[PDB]
Design a protein around this ligand. Structure first.
Ligand SMILES: *[C@@H]1O[C@H](CO[C@@H]2O[C@@H](C)[C@@H](O)[C@@H](O)[C@@H]2O)[C@@H](O[C@@H]2O[C@H](CO)[C@@H](O[C@@H]3O[C@H](CO[C@H]4O[C@H](CO)[C@@H](O)[C@H](O)[C@@H]4O)[C@@H](O)[C@H](O[C@H]4O[C@H](CO)[C@@H](O)[C@H](O)[C@@H]4O[C@H]4O[C@H](CO)[C@@H](O)[C@H](O)[C@@H]4O)[C@@H]3O)[C@H](O)[C@H]2NC(C)=O)[C@H](O)[C@H]1NC(C)=O
Lengths: 49, 49, 50
């Protein structure tokens, strides 16, 4: 019966999950981690990624 | 020896660095410091900065 | 080139400063990594194909 409230909570949670999961996407870069790109690449090549 | 630059022999070495999840076994000449816990530090574990 | 030699490098430390400070190379192109960063990186394995 309380689903109406729980539904709301679920939705919010789902949204945040998606947001966090988007940090694991490369979006075309060699890596999805900024630290790996910065530690492996020179600034001219790192900025492109 | 009389060939042009486009036909003279060239020695080629291709270094393929593999960064898997396994323990690292090829490293640079970088010395490891002491392990500091319970503080905000700038750590570097096997290149993972 | 058809029987290109391959050597596996593992369990060692390499000072790559000597490698890229050398003037004896005409081609030195690194993809996915910078020559000046190798001294700070640790790799699981390296393959040298000559
Ligand atoms: C195995 O390794 C040995 C040692 O390698 C060295 O050490 C290792 C740890 C690593 O750091 C390596 O990168 C490093 O090289 C090899 O022996 C070395 O072989 C080198 C060449 O293969 C050689 O360097 C050359 O030496 C010649 C001759 O130098 C003598 O004469 C000059 C006067 O001309 C004197 O000042 C010297 O003191 C020597 O007495 C030299 O001419 C070469 O310089 C030319 O080439 C350079 C690029 O290689 C250029 O940067 C430089 O400006 C110069 O340019 C000339 O050439 C142009 C054409 O390319 C031309 O157009 C221009 O006008 C110039 O005239 C070069 O420096 C090392 O001396 C030698 N070391 C030892 C100890 O023997 C060995 O060959 C390796 N073995 C294998 C199988 O690979």
């Amino acid at each position: 019966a309380l689903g109406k409230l729980q539904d709301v909570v679920n939705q919010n949670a789902q949204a945040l999950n998606t947001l966090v999961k988007q940090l694991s996407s490369n979006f075309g870069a060699i890596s999805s981690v900024l630290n790996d790109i910065l530690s492996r690449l020179d600034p001219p090549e790192a900025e492109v990624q | 020896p009389t060939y042009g630059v486009g036909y003279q022999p060239y020695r080629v070495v291709v270094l393929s660095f593999e960064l898997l999840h396994a323990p690292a076994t090829v490293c640079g000449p970088k010395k490891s410091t002491n392990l500091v816990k319970n503080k905000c530090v700038n750590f570097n574990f096997n290149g993972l900065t | 080139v058809y029987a290109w030699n391959r050597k596996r490098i593992s369990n060692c430390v390499a000072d790559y400063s000597v490698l890229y400070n050398s003037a004896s190379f005409s081609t030195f192109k690194c993809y996915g990594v910078s020559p000046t960063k190798l001294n700070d990186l640790c790799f699981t394995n390296v393959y040298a194909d000559s």
